[PDB]
Design a protein around this nucleic acid. Structure first.
Ligand code: MG
Ligand code: MG
Ligand code: MG
Ligand code: MG
Ligand code: MG
Ligand code: MG
Ligand code: MG
Ligand code: MG
Ligand code: MG
Ligand code: MG
Ligand code: MG
Ligand code: MG
Ligand code: MG
Ligand code: MG
Ligand code: MG
Ligand code: MG
Ligand code: MG
Ligand code: MG
Ligand code: MG
Ligand code: MG
Ligand code: MG
Ligand code: MG
Ligand code: MG
Ligand code: MG
Ligand code: MG
Ligand code: MG
Ligand code: MG
Ligand code: MG
Ligand code: MG
Ligand code: MG
Ligand code: MG
Ligand code: MG
Ligand code: MG
Ligand code: MG
Ligand code: MG
Ligand code: MG
Ligand code: MG
Ligand code: MG
Ligand code: MG
Ligand code: MG
Ligand code: ZN
Ligand code: ZN
Lengths: 156, 106, 85, 60, 76
RNA sequence: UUAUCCAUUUAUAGGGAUGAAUU
RNA sequence: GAGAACUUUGAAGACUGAAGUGGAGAAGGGUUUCUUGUCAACUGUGAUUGAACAAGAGUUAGCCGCUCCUAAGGGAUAGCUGAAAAGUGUUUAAAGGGGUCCCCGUCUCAAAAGGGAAACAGGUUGAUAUUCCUGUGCCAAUAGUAUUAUGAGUUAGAUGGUAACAUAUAUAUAAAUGAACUCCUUUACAUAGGCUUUACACUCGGGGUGCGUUUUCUUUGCACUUUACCUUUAUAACAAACCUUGGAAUCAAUUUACUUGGAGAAGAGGUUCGUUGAACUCAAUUCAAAAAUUUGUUUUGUAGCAAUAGUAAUUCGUAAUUAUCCGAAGUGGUAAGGACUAUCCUUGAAAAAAGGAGGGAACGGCUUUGUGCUUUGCUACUCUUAAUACUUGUAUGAGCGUACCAACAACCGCAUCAGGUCUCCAAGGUUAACAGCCUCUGGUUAAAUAGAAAAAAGUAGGUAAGGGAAGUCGGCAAAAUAGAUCCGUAACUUCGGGAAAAGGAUUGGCUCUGAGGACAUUAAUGUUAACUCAGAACUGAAACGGACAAGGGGAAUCCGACUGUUUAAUUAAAACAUAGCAUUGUGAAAAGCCACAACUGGUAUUAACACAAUGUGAUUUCUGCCCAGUGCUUUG
RNA sequence: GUCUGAUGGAGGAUCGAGUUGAUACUGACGUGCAAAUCGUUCAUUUCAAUCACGUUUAGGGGCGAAAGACUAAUCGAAAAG
């Protein structure tokens, strides 16, 4: 149902012997066989997951938490990114610019991924056929086709 | 020409109900149901077929000979030879690199 | 011989949908169906498998890219910025 | 092989004739070239040995 | 059903506890006159064992030299 | 901040400096 | 038989025509099934018939199914709401269960087309059959103690190959140690296009056997000539992947198309899987050619099953013999597998269950003091398959379905109603054709009636001199055209079309000529196919896609861009939808839109390239002026 | 950069049996074979395609490519008491 692709990434259990699985929205540039590093001290590189309070101004981020520990809610659709615009002088606060253009202040300990969401540019191809849109919404929900209001009776 | 009919319970043309005609000594045509093909077992790293083992449905695998399910190396019928060669090289060479990097501190 | 003067690839759409829409389709599908350089193995054998996945026919590495091309300028610029620093 | 894939011969007989023609021509041309180069290489041994023969007299 | 070609192995089976009968089939060959082809079959608990004899004299010698507690069956 | 409300988890370390990893 | 157009038998003339009133199942029916009897009523005419009426019978499973698994989903538990009735279903349950004390962790139902231990042939009844009979196989299970036998291992766990990998053949390839913990594989997956292989099907020419025609002709026309599961079936042969040597531009290999290579190509030699299931002298036999393995054959075998069964014939008395069952090829209808290429803003289930590997816990037999840390002591010990005695509750295979119809009178429509109703098999001729027409196997010749006569009028058809829409609101109805091959095709156009535009010529039969392959001996010689395509001469009451089958065309105007959808039973359209264009709301568990009595929910497995609410309706070219009125919205 | 021949097999491409429907005769029938059938003619067949079984939505409510259509011969508000 989703436009963007998903990465399947394997971490090694630290409190027991074993391996564990995660599914994560992938940023444009990731490849199979790559190592990514997540944490408050990870370096600044595409694909790593860092707290937003350790990123310089201008960095493009995605897959962001609007609260710490949230596990990511904001920048998720294909081709979308945000921008770090300002840092508080006493820490504790970070300012970003959301894809819609709004500006929003977040706790400076929240996490995000470096880079932009993959598969960007998919609203530039004309759909061009009714059947293509029949196949598009066939895997989303029952919202198509649409009859307009002026073509009905007053009861409804 | 002689014409045939299903002999078992299933009377539809599904994947588990495929059909083969055969001539009997009495002189008539009859139908026998055919087993499904089985996928080949695959390498745990590169998802390629494992050489030296048979492809059986698990019921037939359960009652098969011991030697027909394995190969004699360090990872047997689970990882192919190329992958094992690379694994051994990575292990030894990276241990050497760590060893030389450590003593480099002084 | 040359079988077509203008439409080239979009000759499968016949006379439908209007000429400018077919022109935009042609521009997009030239990019979508091309072959790209695999920087890992050196051969030019990378082709799209789904709306955001690209796979090399030789070494079989999978790369996440754009929708109609392997790379997009907005990601190229951000990556170059970070590498410069 | 590439000629046959490109629809130059409609038959087996025509292909046999065409290959015989090409083979005879490429044989004749090479036969000429080798006799020419064999003539050329012969003149050098005089050109090489007269050199040192003159050098043994005028120079040393 | 299984086939045996080695007469020593055929004789070993003939003396085992759960061998219950022998079958003697006599048949004329098809290519020519009389070659009285003979087949000897042993009935064990699990399989029949068939050996094919092209020589009538050898077959005749082998069958009477069998243990006298095996029931005998003649189809032709 | 203790009433009240929300979030995450296996409620798993008090604050700073494309191999293997368990008895 | 009291009584036969519609009961039975024989002979005729015909139909169905494999897309069958032919065979086999599901839903629904429930004894309509079988044998015997029989006619008050019914079987819209008759009736001795019958699915009517009466009396008795008939359905046999370890291997066909259910039963087990999970799906879209249903019902419950804890808690929370509500007077309850009821609504929700982890939302803070000491949840239950499983691996020996610790771990894991709600329960239960939902598929007779999805996943899934295991069987074949012949015979047999009035009525059942992969279920009964005969013969030959397979799967699952099988406790403790001993005793014998089979085989392997150290005198605490075996070998070969440079490698890819290989090895247990005992009645039976049964044994190659391996605890906690951890990772992976099978089950397991879409559509389109062509190429290739095997089996079933159909056909041609030889041999044998029986039958038919025979005024004339016909070395003639027809029928039969068979072979199952199972033995890891052994081997042979093919697409593919991989290994060893080798070291590539004058690039090469190669497919219908493709596609590959210093990340190691061609050439040469090997390993494995899949397909398939006696192929290849395959196996057993020495006539022989070096042994501490080579040849044509001495010769057999349908490889075992297997001829003892089946089929087609000829004889012998009121149950027996005998003979055959074998040589070489074509066509491509159906099914499955293989290696590939292409398409998606579409990427095409899960679980019971089974397998593989990493790691290295534990480890003589004996009987002994001390207590698992001792010993003095001897050398058989550990696994593995099979059989037999004894001890134990009685130590192999549970329960349910199975007759018959499936529409033609057994189902639904008030009925023995021209309606409706889901799957599988599929011969010959003519043909592009599973179309139309005729035929062989199988089925039938019956329909709420029959005989005679034959005018008006009707209904379903056919033909018509001369004219050719003058008829009528209106060319409504009918007629004319049609298959292939060879020529020739305008305006306009979004350059793709229009287009089968419009138009023109040909087509039978018979006798000939020419062109398209393979194989093995030497540019010569022979052996052999299979359907197509060109040309010529003759011929006939000028006919030839001879029946069947099968577009009328042109010049313009209006509407909708196109494929698609709609008022079941008076309206199929210019109506709805659609891609494209524009506007509006919303940065989230204190948000937008919507459900609910309350508790709580949907979008949401979501996050502005997103979700929600409207209008217009492809492309091209455009989209002017008005904020006074009514709405909506912003500041205090 | 442009011309000619072959190969190749795209498309909500074309014709057309079956299947799925219902344009015309304003044909038959209209005490019907039938409370919607019969005959000829017509539309549709690779996709917004067709069919079966299972399952979800219940009355001032549901479902609707929209006709006030359909919800068991009953719908501008079903059936039973
Ligand atoms: Mg309306
Ligand atoms: Mg093996
Ligand atoms: Mg009657
Ligand atoms: Mg007829
Ligand atoms: Mg007929
Ligand atoms: Mg037909
Ligand atoms: Mg009866
Ligand atoms: Mg009777
Ligand atoms: Mg009567
Ligand atoms: Mg009765
Ligand atoms: Mg079964
Ligand atoms: Mg469920
Ligand atoms: Mg169940
Ligand atoms: Mg099933
Ligand atoms: Mg019967
Ligand atoms: Mg056989
Ligand atoms: Mg039965
Ligand atoms: Mg039956
Ligand atoms: Mg009724
Ligand atoms: Mg009827
Ligand atoms: Mg009738
Ligand atoms: Mg009349
Ligand atoms: Mg006439
Ligand atoms: Mg006239
Ligand atoms: Mg007039
Ligand atoms: Mg008039
Ligand atoms: Mg007309
Ligand atoms: Mg025109
Ligand atoms: Mg229209
Ligand atoms: Mg239409
Ligand atoms: Mg109507
Ligand atoms: Mg109508
Ligand atoms: Mg409209
Ligand atoms: Mg729209
Ligand atoms: Mg318009
Ligand atoms: Mg105003
Ligand atoms: Mg079409
Ligand atoms: Mg009609
Ligand atoms: Mg009428
Ligand atoms: Mg109205
Ligand atoms: Zn591998
Ligand atoms: Zn690559």
């Amino acid at each position: 149902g989703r436009g963007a692709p998903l990465a399947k990434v394997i971490f090694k259990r630290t409190e027991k012997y074993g391996k564990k699985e995660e599914l994560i929205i992938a940023s444009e540039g990731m490849f199979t066989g790559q190592y990514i590093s997540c944490g408050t001290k990870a370096p600044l590189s595409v694909g790593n997951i860092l707290p937003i309070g350790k990123m310089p101004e201008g960095t493009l981020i995605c897959n962001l938490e609007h609260r710490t520990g949230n596990r990511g809610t904001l920048v998720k659709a294909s081709g979308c990114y945000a921008t770090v615009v300002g840092q508080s002088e006493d820490g504790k606060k970070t300012k970003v610019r959301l894809p819609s253009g709004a500006k929003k202040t977040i706790d400076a300990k929240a996490r995000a991924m470096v880079g932009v969401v993959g598969a960007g540019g998919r609203i530039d191809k004309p759909i061009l056929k009714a059947g293509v849109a029949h196949h598009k919404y066939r895997v989303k929900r029952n919202c198509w086709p649409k009859v307009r209001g002026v073509a009905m009776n007053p009861v409804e | 020409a002689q014409r045939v009919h299903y002999r078992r319970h299933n009377h539809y043309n599904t994947k588990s109900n495929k059909v083969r005609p055969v001539r009997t000594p009495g002189g008539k045509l009859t139908i026998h149901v055919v087993k499904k093909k089985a996928g080949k077992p695959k390498c745990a790293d590169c998802k390629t077929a494992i050489q030296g083992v048979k492809a059986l449905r698990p019921a037939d695998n359960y009652r098969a000979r011991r030697k027909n399910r394995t190969v004699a190396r360090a990872y047997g019928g689970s990882i192919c030879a190329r992958c094992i060669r690379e694994r051994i090289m990575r292990a030894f060479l990276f241990e050497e690199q760590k060893c030389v990097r450590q003593v480099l501190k002084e | 011989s040359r079988r077509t003067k203008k439409v080239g690839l979009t000759g499968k759409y016949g006379t439908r949908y209007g000429s400018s829409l077919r022109k935009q389709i042609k521009k997009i599908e030239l990019m979508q169906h091309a072959k790209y350089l695999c920087t890992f193995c050196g051969k030019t054998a990378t082709k799209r498998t789904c709306v955001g996945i690209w796979k090399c026919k030789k070494c079989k590495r999978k790369v996440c890219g754009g929708a109609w091309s392997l790379t997009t300028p907005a990601a190229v610029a951000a990556k170059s910025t970070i590498i410069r620093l | 092989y590439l000629k046959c894939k490109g629809n130059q011969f409609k038959n087996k007989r025509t292909l046999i004739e065409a290959i015989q023609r090409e083979k005879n021509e490429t044989l004749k041309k090479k036969a000429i070239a080798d006799q020419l180069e064999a003539k050329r290489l012969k003149a050098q041994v005089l050109r090489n040995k007269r050199k040192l023969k003159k050098d043994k007299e005028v120079v040393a | 059903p299984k086939q045996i070609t080695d007469i020593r192995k055929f004789l070993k089976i003939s003396r085992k506890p759960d061998t219950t009968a022998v079958i003697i089939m006599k048949k004329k060959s098809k290519t020519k006159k009389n070659t009285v082809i003979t087949k000897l079959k042993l009935r064990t608990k699990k399989y029949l064992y068939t050996m094919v004899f092209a020589d009538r004299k050898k077959a005749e010698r082998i069958e009477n030299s069998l243990l006298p507690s095996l029931k005998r069956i003649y189809y032709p």
